[PDB]
Amino acid sequence: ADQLTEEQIAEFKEAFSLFDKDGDGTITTKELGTVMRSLGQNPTEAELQDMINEVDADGNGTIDFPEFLTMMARKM
């Protein structure tokens, strides 16, 4: 696997949009909490900040498409 599968990426892309309720191309902690809550997960503000920090490599403070791609890949 040189780069990645165009399908696996797409599936994650559609998942990125579902979480991007504002469509601004930037998943914030508030949006990540809404989703995690819909999946039955109750993350705290400190956990969302750290969960985002472990993957926020641009230092923007939020997860975008490529950043969310990496994060989901880490879940294996």
Residues that bind Ca ion (CB under 5 A): 20, 22, 24, 26, 56, 58, 60, 67
Q: Tell me if 28 is assigned to a ligand binding site.
A: no
> Which is nearer to Ca ion, 44 or 60 (by Cβ)?
60
Q: Tell me if 60 is assigned to a ligand binding site.
A: yes
Asked if 26 and 68 count as a contact pair (C-beta separation under 8 A), the reply is: no
What's the rounded Cα separation, in Å, for the pair 27 and 11?
A: 17
Q: How many residues does the chain have?
A: 76
Of 54, 59, 57, 67, which Cα lies nearest the Cα of 26?
Answer: 67
Q: Tell me if 54 is assigned to a ligand binding site.
A: no
> Which is nearer to Ca ion, 24 or 54 (by Cβ)?
24
Binding site, annotated residues for Ca(2+): 20, 22, 24, 26, 31, 56, 58, 60, 62, 67
